[PDB]
Amino acid sequence: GDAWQDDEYFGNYGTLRLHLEMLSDKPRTETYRQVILSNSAALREKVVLDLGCGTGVISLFCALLAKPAGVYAVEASSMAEHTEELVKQNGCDGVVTVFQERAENLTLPTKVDVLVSEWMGNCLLFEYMLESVLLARDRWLKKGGMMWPSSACLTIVPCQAFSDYRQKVEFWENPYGLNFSYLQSLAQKEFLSKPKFSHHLQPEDCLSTPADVITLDMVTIQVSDLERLKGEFTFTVEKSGMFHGFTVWFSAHFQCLEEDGPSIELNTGPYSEITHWKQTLFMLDAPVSVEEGDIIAGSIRLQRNPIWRRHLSITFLWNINSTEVSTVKTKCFPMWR
Amino acid sequence: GDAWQDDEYFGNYGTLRLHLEMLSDKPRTETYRQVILSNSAALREKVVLDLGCGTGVISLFCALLAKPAGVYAVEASSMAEHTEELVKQNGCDGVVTVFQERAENLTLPTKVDVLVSEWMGNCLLFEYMLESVLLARDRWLKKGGMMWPSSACLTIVPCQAFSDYRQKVEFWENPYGLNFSYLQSLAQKEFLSKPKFSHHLQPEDCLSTPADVITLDMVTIQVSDLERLKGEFTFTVEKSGMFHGFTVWFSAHFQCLEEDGPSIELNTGPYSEITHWKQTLFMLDAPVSVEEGDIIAGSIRLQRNPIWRRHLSITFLWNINSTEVSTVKTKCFPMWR
Numbered sequence: 321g322d323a324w325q326d327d328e329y330f331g332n333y334g335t336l337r338l339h340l341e342m343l344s345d346k347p348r349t350e351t352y353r354q355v356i357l358s359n360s361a362a363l364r365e366k367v368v369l370d371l372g373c374g375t376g377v378i379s380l381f382c383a384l385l386a387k388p389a390g391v392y393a394v395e396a397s398s399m400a401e402h403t404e405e406l407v408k409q410n411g412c413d414g415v416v417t418v419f420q421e422r423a424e425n426l427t428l429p430t431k432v433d434v435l436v437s438e439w440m441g442n443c444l445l446f447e448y449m450l451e452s453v454l455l456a457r458d459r460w461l462k463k464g465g466m467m468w469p470s471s472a473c474l475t476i477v478p479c480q481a482f483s484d485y486r487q488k489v490e491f492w493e494n495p496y497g498l499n500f501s502y503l504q505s506l507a508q509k510e511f512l513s514k515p516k517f518s519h520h521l522q523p524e525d526c527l528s529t530p531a532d533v534i535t536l537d538m539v540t541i542q543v544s545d546l547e548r549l550k551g552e553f554t555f556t557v558e559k560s561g562m563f564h565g566f567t568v569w570f571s572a573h574f575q576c577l578e579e580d581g582p583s584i585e586l587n588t589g590p591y592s593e594i595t596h597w598k599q600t601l602f603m604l605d606a607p608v609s610v611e612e613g614d615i616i617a618g619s620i621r622l623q624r625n626p627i628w629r630r631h632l633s634i635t636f637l638w639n640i641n642s643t644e645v646s647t648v649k650t651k652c653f654p655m656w657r
Numbered sequence: 658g659d660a661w662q663d664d665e666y667f668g669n670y671g672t673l674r675l676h677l678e679m680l681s682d683k684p685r686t687e688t689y690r691q692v693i694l695s696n697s698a699a700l701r702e703k704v705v706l707d708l709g710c711g712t713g714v715i716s717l718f719c720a721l722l723a724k725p726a727g728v729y730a731v732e733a734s735s736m737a738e739h740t741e742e743l744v745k746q747n748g749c750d751g752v753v754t755v756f757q758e759r760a761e762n763l764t765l766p767t768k769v770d771v772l773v774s775e776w777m778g779n780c781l782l783f784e785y786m787l788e789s790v791l792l793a794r795d796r797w798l799k800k801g802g803m804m805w806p807s808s809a810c811l812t813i814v815p816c817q818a819f820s821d822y823r824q825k826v827e828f829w830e831n832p833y834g835l836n837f838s839y840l841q842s843l844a845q846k847e848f849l850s851k852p853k854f855s856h857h858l859q860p861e862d863c864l865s866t867p868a869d870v871i872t873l874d875m876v877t878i879q880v881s882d883l884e885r886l887k888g889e890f891t892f893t894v895e896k897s898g899m900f901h902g903f904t905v906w907f908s909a910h911f912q913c914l915e916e917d918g919p920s921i922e923l924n925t926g927p928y929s930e931i932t933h934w935k936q937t938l939f940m941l942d943a944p945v946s947v948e949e950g951d952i953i954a955g956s957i958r959l960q961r962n963p964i965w966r967r968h969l970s971i972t973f974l975w976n977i978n979s980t981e982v983s984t985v986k987t988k989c990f991p992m993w994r
């Protein structure tokens with residue numbers, strides 16, 4: 321409710337702006353289309369729950385690209401009223417049923433064989449729609465049923481971010497020949513203490529090979545596991561450069577309904593086609609130069625905000641060519657836009 | 658106060674984000690630098706009022722690139738506390754005095770010879786800082802004194818906007834093969850009823866030569882003139898194309914202090930270097946095809962909001978190859994972000 325900021329959250333999803341962004345994201349939307357196509361024969365006579373269907377696009381993929389026994393399209397925002405009309409104008413109202421309900425207070429006619437949802441936020445967990453997905457899974461997913469995505473993982477890499485640091489911090493040293501360096505302290509707090517959403521990381525700015533640090537198993541994960549997620553990492557710097565911070569993204573995996581089948585992946589990283597999530601940048605307070613062979617090791621922690629339940633803080637701990645504790649640095653980034 | 662949303666307006670100018678945007682705007686900031694340089698000798702022993710000085714950059718241009726008798730740097734936001742320190746760290750605290758005051762409640766030691774300000778908003782008038790500038794002019798500018806800018810004008814052109822109309826309106830006809838055309842009515846209201854700030858108009862999308870429609874004389878204009886500004890226009894379409902709407906920008910002119918001197922111009926239009934204002938796009942409800950020789954004539958009206966005094970509505974009236982009144986179309990755009 322108020323702790324979930326549901327008025328603002330679902331109010332935003334009642335306008336076309338966010339849905340235009342999702343549907344204009346071709347890698348994202350086509351991935352879900354490909355999952356339905358790759359599993360078309362296996363979906364026949366299955367009951368599908370599309371949790372948070374928005375405009376209903378995923379439900380329409382299920383009803384038009386396969387032959388399920390039924391599709392339950394669930395959407396809590398005011399968009400559901402239009403989704404019902406869209407389903408009917410695409411000739412699917414006999415298979416797709418629209419429920420204008422929250423997953424938490426959901427009443428469905430039957431349990432389901434497949435629960436498909438697009439719940440991933442920035443750095444995977446932001447806004448914690450995953451909680452709603454897990455609650456609907458526990459109540460409505462039949463034993464042996466399929467979660468789509470079936471697993472997800474958080475991936476990070478040490479990176480260079482020259483343009484960001486120069487434009488936001490070093491800029492103040494001599495703009496037009498004026499000494500504005502007195503503002504650099506304020507610039508570090510205002511521009512570097514928060515994550516930068518919609519960062520486009522270039523491959524040449526990666527200082528090492530990216531590593532998966534946290535992996536979520538969508539069948540076994542529980543709501544209580546989401547309060548604090550942690551992963552260790554150790555990076556060998558592969559090219560000499562400037563360590564400005566960490567870039568974070570995620571992947572989502574869609575297991576085939578049949579063991580012998582194709583598994584489909586949605587990757588939001590720098591080596592894949594850009595998505596509306598792009599990547600997320602976490603700047604250090606001060607950059608440090610590094611050379612090939614340097615070891616950057618530590619951990620990342622995603623700590624859910626105890627009061628504002630759609631928010632979290634991301635804490636990096638890292639050490640460069642060292643194991644001691646007096647050398648360890650840490651920075652905590654509140655995840656707010 | 659509340660009708661001026663001063664808490665939010667001056668709160669925004671208390672952070673570095675907006676000042677970084679202004680100072681990173683090289684055409685904007687260098688223009689004011691060039692005005693000071695071009696008038697350096699004429700500014701000697703003059704008293705200068707920098708109204709809304711922000712970080713104090715314009716005041717520092719005056720004290721460092723000329724020899725004025727004194728510079729009054731006035732800033733109502735919390736940035737003024739830092740501006741005072743910036744002035745001192747640039748060795749100008751003997752010439753520049755910082756006043757953390759609103760122009761409306763301003764108490765200066767003397768009247769001034771020059772009133773310089775960067776007050777222009779989107780479509781020139783947005784947020785109506787010009788009102789504050791005119792009130793300070795009436796009280797503090799000596800007779801014969803100089804306003805900088807000394808004049809400004811609003812410029813518009815009929816234009817093509819294919820990408821905007823396709824991405825926001827036509828997109829819904831067949832996304833991924835689905836018929837979402839039922840959403841086009843909602844898309845027209847959500848995406849086309851409001852102005853699009855930060856539009857980058859390309860030269861090849863101009864359907865005619867741009868025309869100045871409203872011109873403001875900064876010495877003679879009065880606050881009461883700002884309630885309703887109107888200008889007529891008539892465009893001969895120079896290339897066959899698609900009439901998607903109107904693009905609007907402005908120019909500001911800086912008269913030399915001496916008659917025989919260079920006059921300097923800041924232009925935010927498509928034939929000039931891009932500024933942080935870019936241009937502003939006003940989309941029609943439905944595009945119309947036009948051919949070379951077609952006449953698009955009508956008027957534009959900037960009507961100040963009577964309640965929310967930093968806002969306005971922009972009303973276009975236009976007619977294509979016609980003089981009658983039953984053929985006239987009109988669209989009113991509320992100026993909100």
Ligand SMILES: Nc1ncnc2c1ncn2[C@@H]1O[C@H](CSCC[C@H](N)C(=O)O)[C@@H](O)[C@H]1O
Pocket residue numbers: 330333342343371372373374375376377378394395396397421422423424438439449452
């Ligand atoms: N607890 C909940 N119950 C029902 N719907 C929810 C929900 N939490 C989020 N949603 C909805 O899930 C949607 C997430 S965005 C994805 C929309 C659509 N499935 C697509 O892929 O294009 C939003 O419309 C949001 O309103």
Ligand SMILES: Nc1ncnc2c1ncn2[C@@H]1O[C@H](CSCC[C@H](N)C(=O)O)[C@@H](O)[C@H]1O
Pocket residue numbers: 667670679680708709710711712713714715731732733734758759760761775776786789
């Ligand atoms: N009525 C008023 N009194 C004092 N300052 C005002 C004002 N209205 C606007 N301002 C200030 O004027 C500034 C406008 S932006 C320009 C800042 C600076 N002169 C530069 O060119 O970089 C803001 O800092 C704003 O706070």
Ligand SMILES: [Cl-]
Pocket residue numbers: 496497498718721722
């Ligand atoms: Cl300078």
Ligand SMILES: [Cl-]
Pocket residue numbers: 381384385833834835
């Ligand atoms: Cl399809």
Ligand code: NA
Pocket residue numbers: 400401404418419420
């Ligand atoms: Na409904």
Ligand code: NA
Pocket residue numbers: 473475532571
């Ligand atoms: Na991976």
Ligand code: NA
Pocket residue numbers: 737738741755756757
């Ligand atoms: Na002060």
Ligand code: NA
Pocket residue numbers: 810812869908
């Ligand atoms: Na002009």
